[PDB]
Amino acid sequence: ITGTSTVGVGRGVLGDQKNINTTYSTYYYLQDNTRGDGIFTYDAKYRTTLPGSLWADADNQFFASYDAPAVDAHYYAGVTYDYYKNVHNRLSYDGNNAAIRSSVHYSQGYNNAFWNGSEMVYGDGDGQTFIPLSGGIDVVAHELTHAVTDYTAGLIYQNESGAINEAISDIFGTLVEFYANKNPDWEIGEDVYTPGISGDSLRSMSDPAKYGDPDHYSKRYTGTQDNGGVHINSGIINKAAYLISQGGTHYGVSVVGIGRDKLGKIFYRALTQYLTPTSNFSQLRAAAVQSATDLYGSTSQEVASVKQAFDAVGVK
Ligand SMILES: [Ca+2]
Ligand SMILES: [Ca+2]
Ligand SMILES: [Ca+2]
Ligand SMILES: [Ca+2]
Ligand SMILES: [Zn+2]
Numbered sequence: 001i002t003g004t005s006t007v008g009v010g011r012g013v014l015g016d017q018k019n020i021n022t023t024y025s026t027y028y029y030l031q032d033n034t035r036g037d038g039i040f041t042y043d044a045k046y047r048t049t050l051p052g053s054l055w056a057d058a059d060n061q062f063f064a065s066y067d068a069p070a071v072d073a074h075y076y077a078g079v080t081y082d083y084y085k086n087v088h089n090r091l092s093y094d095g096n097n098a099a100i101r102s103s104v105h106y107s108q109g110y111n112n113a114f115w116n117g118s119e120m121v122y123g124d125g126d127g128q129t130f131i132p133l134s135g136g137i138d139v140v141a142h143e144l145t146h147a148v149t150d151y152t153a154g155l156i157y158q159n160e161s162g163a164i165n166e167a168i169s170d171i172f173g174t175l176v177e178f179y180a181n182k183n184p185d186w187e188i189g190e191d192v193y194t195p196g197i198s199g200d201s202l203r204s205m206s207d208p209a210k211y212g213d214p215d216h217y218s219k220r221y222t223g224t225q226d227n228g229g230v231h232i233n234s235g236i237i238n239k240a241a242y243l244i245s246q247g248g249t250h251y252g253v254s255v256v257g258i259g260r261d262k263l264g265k266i267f268y269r270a271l272t273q274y275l276t277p278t279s280n281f282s283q284l285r286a287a288a289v290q291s292a293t294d295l296y297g298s299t300s301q302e303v304a305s306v307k308q309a310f311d312a313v314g315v316k
Helices: 066-087 137-151 161-180 225-229 232-247 260-274 281-296 301-312
Strands: 004-011 019-023 028-029 039-043 100-106 113-115 118-121 248-250 252-256
Touching: 004 066, 019 066, 019 137, 039 066, 066 100, 066 118, 066 137, 066 161, 066 260, 113 137, 118 137, 137 161, 161 225, 161 232, 161 260, 161 281, 232 248, 232 260, 232 281, 232 301, 252 301, 260 281, 281 301
Parallel strands: 039 100, 100 118
Antiparallel strands: 004 019, 019 028, 113 118, 248 252
16 A cells, blocks of 8 residues: 555554554555565455455554454564564565565464465464464464575475475574564474463474474384375474584484574575475485585584584484
């Protein structure tokens, strides 16, 4: 919409008050003109027709409980945009400042959130398993990271390349959680998962087996469910990313940790320069070793820790 840039105020899913970039034209719209070609948040109105209506508000105040999922989707899209821009010099998901569009209130009791090829889509959850999915910055950054992958490596969403595609999104969603710096950790979705139970989540990167996911190649899932285990086998690569960053000894193999910033640099470079649509785990290992070599030199601690982390998860 054509109008003026304004600043609204509202409350997110977890009751935190935040400022949001809006656009004024008769109504105040959730359209942030300050980042790239805009961030636009829409109301799907409990239906599944997309995108729905650009979110309109009469007074630029977003404190109704109905407002909360839109507040967070809009705000966390902006945080994710800033993470890629300030940390990776990447402008939006296509690298050319493409508009970021998100719809909330998708369907009824929908316990999921996804990138549909053109935009973000968040369910409200059923109140039991999930609360509104845009309340988790790691969920928002996970799903936007699929857009990044689609425009770069284009890893096919099946078998090994699919598990890489999933792991990359868990990794960058976690790094965005740390960048924003509010109660960060190495689990996925804890802020929106099961309002009745402390300390759980959908997935753990530090300990994938906590929720049934393999933490070593010898334990890979080889069936056909979940597109050949894209959410299951991502645990192997998540654990390797965790070891590269934090360090540790895993099945007897010791890894010197190099920290989150270098992990991000290494995996961003592999993603955008070395991985291809059909890459398997062993090709991810080579890409990450080549990335660390370009960035830090062939004799570096960084390269040595990458090799150790992949050794620890059984990937040669
Ligand atoms: Ca209002
Ligand atoms: Ca957290
Ligand atoms: Ca988390
Ligand atoms: Ca919980
Ligand atoms: Zn995903």
